[PDB]
Design a protein around this ligand. Sequence first.
Ligand SMILES: Cc1cc2nc3c(=O)[nH]c(=O)nc-3n(C[C@H](O)[C@H](O)[C@H](O)COP(=O)(O)OP(=O)(O)OC[C@H]3O[C@@H](n4cnc5c(N)ncnc54)[C@H](O)[C@@H]3O)c2cc1C
Ligand SMILES: Cc1cc2nc3c(=O)[nH]c(=O)nc-3n(C[C@H](O)[C@H](O)[C@H](O)COP(=O)(O)OP(=O)(O)OC[C@H]3O[C@@H](n4cnc5c(N)ncnc54)[C@H](O)[C@@H]3O)c2cc1C
Ligand SMILES: Cn1nccc1C(=O)NCc1cccs1
Ligand SMILES: Cn1nccc1C(=O)NCc1cccs1
Ligand SMILES: Cn1nccc1C(=O)NCc1cccs1
Ligand SMILES: Cn1nccc1C(=O)NCc1cccs1
Lengths: 587, 587
Amino acid sequence: GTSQWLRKTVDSAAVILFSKTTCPYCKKVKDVLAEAKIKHATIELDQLSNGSAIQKCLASFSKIETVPQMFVRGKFIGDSQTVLKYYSNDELAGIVNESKYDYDLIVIGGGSGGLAAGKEAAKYGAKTAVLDYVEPTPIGTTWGLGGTCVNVGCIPKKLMHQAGLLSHALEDAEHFGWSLDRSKISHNWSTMVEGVQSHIGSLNWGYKVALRDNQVTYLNAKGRLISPHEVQITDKNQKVSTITGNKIILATGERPKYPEIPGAVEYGITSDDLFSLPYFPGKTLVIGASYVALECAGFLASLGGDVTVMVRSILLRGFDQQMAEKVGDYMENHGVKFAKLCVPDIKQLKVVDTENNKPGLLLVKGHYTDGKKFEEEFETVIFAVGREPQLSKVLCETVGVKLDKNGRVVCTDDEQTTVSNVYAIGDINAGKPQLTPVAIQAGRYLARRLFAGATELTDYSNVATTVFTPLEYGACGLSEEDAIEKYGDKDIEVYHSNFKPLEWTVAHREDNVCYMKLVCRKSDNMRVLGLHVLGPNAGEITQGYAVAIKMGATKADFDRTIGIHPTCSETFTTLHVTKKSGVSPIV
Amino acid sequence: GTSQWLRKTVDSAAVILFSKTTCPYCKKVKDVLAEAKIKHATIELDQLSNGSAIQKCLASFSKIETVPQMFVRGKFIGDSQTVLKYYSNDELAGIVNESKYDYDLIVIGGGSGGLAAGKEAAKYGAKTAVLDYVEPTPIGTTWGLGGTCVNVGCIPKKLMHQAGLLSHALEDAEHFGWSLDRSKISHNWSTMVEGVQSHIGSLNWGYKVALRDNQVTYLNAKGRLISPHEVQITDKNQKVSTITGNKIILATGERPKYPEIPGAVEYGITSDDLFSLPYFPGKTLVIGASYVALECAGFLASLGGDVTVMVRSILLRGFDQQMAEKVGDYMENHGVKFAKLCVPDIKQLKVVDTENNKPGLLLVKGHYTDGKKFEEEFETVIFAVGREPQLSKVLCETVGVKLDKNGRVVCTDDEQTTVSNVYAIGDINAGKPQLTPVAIQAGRYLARRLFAGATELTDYSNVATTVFTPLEYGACGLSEEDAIEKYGDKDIEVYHSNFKPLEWTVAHREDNVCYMKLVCRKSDNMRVLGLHVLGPNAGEITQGYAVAIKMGATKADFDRTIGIHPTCSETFTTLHVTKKSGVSPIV
Ligand SMILES: Cc1cc2nc3c(=O)[nH]c(=O)nc-3n(C[C@H](O)[C@H](O)[C@H](O)COP(=O)(O)OP(=O)(O)OC[C@H]3O[C@@H](n4cnc5c(N)ncnc54)[C@H](O)[C@@H]3O)c2cc1C
Ligand SMILES: Cc1cc2nc3c(=O)[nH]c(=O)nc-3n(C[C@H](O)[C@H](O)[C@H](O)COP(=O)(O)OP(=O)(O)OC[C@H]3O[C@@H](n4cnc5c(N)ncnc54)[C@H](O)[C@@H]3O)c2cc1C
Ligand SMILES: Cn1nccc1C(=O)NCc1cccs1
Ligand SMILES: Cn1nccc1C(=O)NCc1cccs1
Ligand SMILES: Cn1nccc1C(=O)NCc1cccs1
Ligand SMILES: Cn1nccc1C(=O)NCc1cccs1
């Protein structure tokens, strides 16, 4: 119980001090450690309900039951007198740096999860290295430190979404009294990309400064785990060497897939290339139906592009399908064309004009599910048909780390793999939501358990999401069809309503396109199982409700809470029309 | 408790049917009442906890313990045979329509609370009248049905706020690649007012249609309660008559105050006049420091006005003063001038030019709090120095309804006045938050208790707010200073952080102006006592957290909930810097 926790804490902490808030001897040790610039974890036994028991259990390691007690990498170092002896004799530095390994922690992968984990571990005195390398895309695209979200993901895509949203802000402004003429205004792609890339570059730099300031070793090198404690590194001159670490965190993420058809790799691109592309894509085909495919098609259309989406079966597989259809219907009414039930079988007509900064030209041939043919010309073809890890590049099979059928790492609920000192976080952790805030929380909480004696786990249930399509879609919890599957139709009640943002009235926008619903369980006091909203600022709307759902909110909790007026979100506080009543949700 | 409840429900309901969902005899009576277009409340006993005990208590009125049983204004009417007997003999309509009074409910005042109460009561078969009259402002301004929020409050001010926000959207668009030149674009006040007023006109019409479709009598007439059941009405020709009603709801609201100084009434205006003003205000002085004053000064500055605010002492008295100061400093850096610690002692230099649609010119004289004098010319002067009811207009003193020292109605926790059949809701209910969603909930919940046997009360605690200044300010719960006063500084912990919206990066806006904090009580599991946020879309951010605070959220509930990325709201899910630690909150 307590004895198994304390044994795990002492064995894996790099430098840790067992202490009491009221002890002047403990303050003296803390003061010396800060002078020497020795970072460490601290456990204050008068803050724990069973601190009395823990302090007796410490004697099993040190043969004493007093505070303070200092440990380094599993070894009792001393009490107050002994630590001060080592300091005044100039022996303490060499003691706190003694290790069987080069590093207490090696993180393979410098993205959302890996950077968060490495910074948190270094705070408690773990000597840490972060490895990051970006394998170039087929056309040669590469980028800096920070991972998929920072460089080719959430950050550039929401900036480009905002450039798209501003098109409708320019339109609205005339109705609110401003003198501009929207039909006379055009968009400059390269000016936008330059501004987006300048911000990304400031993030690349900020991460390198943060690692430097936390005393983390950053290696721009590709890592491969060749045994439980050995990592082979290849640098930018193909120099190969080996470094060793006590704990290993795998955090290498995923990359886009291509279909196995002629011309796909040679002549199409992916999201990896889009966010730094030097020319406007022009007339564009997006192949796929994920949130990546629809978000990219959406902003390209708002920026004035001629955009088509090729859909194999359905939009947004895995999300609530009533909401997915409403998302696509809005896109189609606002200029995005859809080739439904269709797959591709890519021919090059013109090479990309790198001189004049212009796209090439491609012939796309495909077929509909009934066998009819598809054939049309496009300037750019973007593939958004899923993402995958490539761990047979990071991980020698002899190490013994178990992978599932999709190539992701099978982990315990505390991120441990089948090898005791090796852990995995982020998109490569099998079965977990693949989101930046999840990877960050997992990485921070893991570092605290390894190096500061924490026990708290990451909670992966009911994590909210937002799809940043031209009209945004926020969700938290089950889809309506998943709720009915799990509990049966007779135990599910759905409250819903259309709404119109007040901002849309003077601007003469649509009356009954925005929509929201709560999916509830009758036999469990009308517990809210899932929340869904389509409208502007849907991520801001959804976030706060995610705390209430974590807390077990019921329909009655929504009813008794008062709305803020005038807002979109307040419509959730007065819902009353059920789907089983058959009454229209229009307002 | 069961027997005194049923007594109160039967005496109060206009038409009510006690029923069971499984009974075909009940179904037959429902369809007869529907065919007859007789509206009524229904109590399904096979869905209540103590439904078996109520069924037996019904015999004290009807001498039967069986179901269905229908009652009209306190009298038992009959079972299934007896009701069809009345229907077959064409006796039913005369029975359901017999009453001592003209109406079951008279609502005095057709604003946010009054219209909501009237429509909900009519749902249960209560014969209802709604009286509304708008007394003109000193310069003669008047408007249509719907109250302060609809015509001269939340709706027009947030539309005008949006027109102001679009000026900075026009500025941002250049940085995101759009080809306009903000510096050559101007704003037309009269075009914006026409769009705003056309939307308000559609709401006036919608409310009249809604009342007609619910069989509610709408009288555009001034009402005066002269006895507990008698309302004297004066129509548009000052024809005076009297109508009678069983229950009365006072819902007459407030109007702006003027200071007691020369020239104020003659030459100044209030928010009542601003939202339909036919000329641009020009160089404007706003006198006051309430959320009304700051919201109005805010959008006038963003439209291009030369705007000054004259402040007697502090901004936003009653709100968290750290947050109020941040609100005002942002406004001062973005064009609003402030005349601090200053009060007015108004002279007319030019009369308003109603023909050429031009403002007049005024000389304002005042003094600062030490002794220096204030003297400057303005084209428009706006007073926002509080609001008050004038219930002497509405309520004869002899009726016996107790008012407080401010002229508001003293009520019980179920809105009852000191006269048993008279109730008050909305801004005139003493001590309650003066907000439109509060008035709507109160009115709806009260109507259900009067006419459908409901017991649920309106919960007035922890009601969230938003101030729609140029940078918006949302809050739910206690200010920091009120928490410290209530519990003591050692029992309060405050977590806080600056943030920067992602949308502001490419647009080159400010790094550390947006700000958020959680005020928590240490000795109660670090319960969240109050939430505060300064930033864009603050009302959408705050709303969802109000449900969590209503359910008693702690800091650990915020910690275990995962963020949505990229949003402003997600910063609440990872707060960690305490005020007590002294660490900087900047990003
Ligand atoms: C277009 C797009 C949009 C997205 N939008 C959002 C959004 O709005 N919100 C959201 O929450 N999520 C979004 N995501 C998902 C988000 O990007 C991921 O969930 C997140 O980046 C996962 O972080 P990670 O640490 O697991 O991996 P990554 O961020 O992918 O980091 C892994 C890093 O390790 C490097 N690496 C790989 N192999 C090696 C090796 N052998 N040695 C060294 N380094 C190596 C990789 O090059 C990379 O730099 C989006 C993703 C995409 C593609
Ligand atoms: C500028 C401004 C901005 C505001 N912004 C917001 C906001 O963003 N959010 C928010 O929640 N609240 C806001 N409010 C507050 C909101 O308007 C009020 O809380 C709400 O309107 C109160 O509703 P009510 O039913 O109590 O009264 P009202 O809506 O004022 O309705 C009362 C009606 O009764 C009429 N009446 C008066 N006497 C008589 C009589 N003798 N006979 C017949 N009829 C009579 C009045 O003319 C009026 O039409 C704002 C207020 C102002 C002034
Ligand atoms: C069975 N399994 N599948 C994946 C991960 C595991 C597991 O139990 N790992 C925990 C360990 C403790 C010691 C060494 S590994
Ligand atoms: C008041 N309330 N709290 C919870 C559910 C309800 C409710 O019945 N809403 C009524 C209407 C909302 C919008 C138009 S009518
Ligand atoms: C009149 N009445 N009938 C039953 C209950 C009441 C009542 O308490 N009225 C409200 C009050 C306001 C101030 C003091 S009491
Ligand atoms: C991870 N977490 N969950 C709850 C509170 C925290 C925390 O300590 N936040 C760390 C940082 C936030 C922003 C920059 S560093």
